[PDB]
């Protein structure tokens with residue numbers, strides 16, 4: 588694990604992008620020393636130990652890396668410790684699905700599911716439990732390419748360890764598996780539960796899970812056998828994937844390797860698996876196009 592220290596004087600045009608539970612994220616241009624290459628970058632800050640643990644996890648999983656997992660370029664030491672990554676120009680996938688709903692087709696939704704399952708399979712191979720998978724922590728590099736971000740709650744499992752036992756710190760109940768809510772146990776299979784909630788958010792075009800329901804009632808709702816509803820665009824095969832992700836027995840949930848396969852099978856005939864009105868006449872910018880340059884957490 589190697590952390591690059593990118594000089595403060597090397598960054599220009601730093602401007603705010605947004606704020607929330609993740610802290611503050613800005614956009615800027617990193618001009619590396621001794622070379623002329625103005626790189627669009629995203630800068631995050633918030634507790635300076637919590638942001639350094641995020642950097643360690645990200646650097647530990649950098650080699651070989653994955654196209655669908657955010658890569659840490661380096662860190663910067665200004666008044667606070669800042670994280671630096673390649674800027675994802677289209678922003679957060681949760682805001683992207685809400686803004687571009689009337690132009691997102693079935694091919695895009697099923698490919699995003701494939702790409703998130705690919706990045707999660709890579710993280711599982713590196714013994715990394717993300718613990719915060721949600722549409723808010725999936726970014727859009729191009730409309731056709733998404734990346735998993737935010738390793739604030741992510742934990743590397745020890746060689747012998749199969750699970751992480753968390754402290755009383757704030758965690759996202761409505762995205763968490765039932766064993767994480769009751770016993771604070773986090774595994775790659777608990778991430779499969781959160782992956783299913785992320786898919787439900789994409790399929791509903793950014794709806795809030797368990798909207799209006801308090802988080803203190805979720806364990807009870809889940810123990811009664813109740814789950815997030817069938818999104819209107821989902822055929823039964825897509826919804827059964829989400830429902831297999833939210834099974835009580837963690838081992839019975841699909842594996843990220845199986846989700847890559849099942850959603851890739853769906854992406855080969857996307858209009859069979861998702862019924863979207865006006866799907867054949869929907870378009871989003873692509874780097875292939877000549878005009879591409881124009882374009883929650885609670886105390887347990």
Ligand SMILES: COc1c(Cl)cccc1Nc1c(-c2ccncc2OC[C@@H]2CCCO2)[nH]c2c1C(=O)NCC2
Pocket residue numbers: 604605606609612628629630631657658659660670671672673674675676678679723724726736737738
């Ligand atoms: C953890 O990876 C990062 C690093 Cl190392 C540095 C800067 C940002 C991020 N990621 C994030 C971006 C981000 C990364 C790349 N390009 C643009 C970005 O912001 C897009 C919009 C702006 C406001 C919310 O997201 N946006 C978010 C994270 C995050 O960790 N949590 C949720 C919000």
